[PDB]
DNA sequence: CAGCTGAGTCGAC
DNA sequence: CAGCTGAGTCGAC
DNA sequence: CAGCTGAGTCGAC
């Protein structure tokens, strides 16, 4: 039943996350962490402090797909275990220094062809697949996008819901 | 001294 | 059975 | 997050 997913998404804020490669998204799924560029990092830290849930919807550049979505469980933190990100040309470790903890809600993929009917009113009513890293998605649009994902049987939402209450 | 730059897709060609 | 698909840049948005 | 960018002359063409 979608009621427990809908619970997590109530009053949430939604952000498109773009990755230059697949490897860092697979690493994010294995380790439950994410790092982003500094302007987006500050925006996510601010959203985490005020929003009931901050939802990151992942899409690898030029893949034509979303690869899943996750909920922020902490602000970004520096120091400790350095994440062995695969750095594309022009990307540095210091560029991505802050590490967010995230809890995956769905790790299954959704191709753009199945979201062709969803438009984001916070991006000129363009299709939700249109956007740069950190593009905010309006509440209703982001909710419907997350509900389009097939259910992920490898996900138990207990830990997420427990830390929310 | 401060702002930019470094994780957009699409169609034409 | 045979053809396609898998190593284009650019500007609009 | 850090480095760059924003007060060179000259000769070939």
């Amino acid at each position: 039943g979608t009621s427990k997913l809908k619970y997590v998404l109530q009053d949430a804020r939604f952000f498109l996350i773009k990755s230059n490669n697949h490897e860092n998204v697979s690493l994010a799924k294995a380790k439950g962490v994410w790092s982003t560029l500094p302007v987006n990092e500050k925006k996510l830290n601010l959203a985490f402090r005020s929003a009931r849930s901050v939802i990151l919807i992942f899409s690898v550049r030029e893949s034509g797909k979303f690869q899943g979505f996750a909920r922020l469980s902490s602000e970004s933190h520096h120091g400790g275990s350095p994440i062995h990100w695969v750095l594309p040309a022009g990307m540095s470790a210091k560029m991505l220094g802050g590490v967010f903890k995230i809890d995956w809600i769905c790790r299954r993929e959704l191709p753009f062809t199945k979201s062709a009917h969803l438009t984001n009113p916070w991006n000129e009513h363009k299709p939700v697949k249109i956007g740069r890293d950190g593009q905010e998605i309006e509440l209703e649009c982001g909710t419907q996008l997350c509900l389009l994902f097939p259910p992920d049987e490898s996900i138990d939402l207990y830990q997420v819901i427990h830390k929310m209450r």
Side-chain angles (χ1 to χ4, degrees), chain A residues 30-80 82-108 110-123 125-129:
Chain A
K31 309 214 64 143
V33 296
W34 191 242
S35 299
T36 188
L37 293 176
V39 174
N40 278 339
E41 184 190 4
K42 183 182 172 283
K43 178 162 65 190
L44 290 180
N45 281 331
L46 285 177
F48 180 82
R49 291 177 191 141
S50 53
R52 174 174 183 276
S53 288
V54 177
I55 305 290
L56 309 185
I57 307 178
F58 284 74
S59 169
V60 172
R61 186 166 70 82
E62 296 185 359
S63 71
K65 288 174 118 223
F66 302 99
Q67 281 79 14
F69 60 102
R71 179 184 180 278
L72 282 192
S73 74
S74 82
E75 316 191 20
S76 68
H77 293 285
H78 297 69
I83 303 304
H84 294 95
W85 303 120
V86 177
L87 299 174
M91 301 209 78
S92 89
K94 289 218 130 153
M95 228 174 261
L96 306 166
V99 177
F100 296 87
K101 295 206 226 173
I102 63 177
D103 294 314
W104 287 88
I105 309 304
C106 175
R107 292 182 295 259
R108 296 191 62 186
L110 183 76
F112 289 168
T113 36
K114 299 217 150 179
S115 65
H117 63 294
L118 289 189
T119 63
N120 181 5
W122 290 357
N123 191 27
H125 297 83
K126 293 182 172 269
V128 72
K129 67 175 176 184

Side-chain angles (χ1 to χ4, degrees), chain A residues 13-14 120-123 125 135-139:
Chain A
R13 288 178 60 186
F14 297 86
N120 181 5
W122 290 357
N123 191 27
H125 297 83
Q135 172 67 49
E136 190 151 9
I137 302 167
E138 180 269 339
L139 171 77

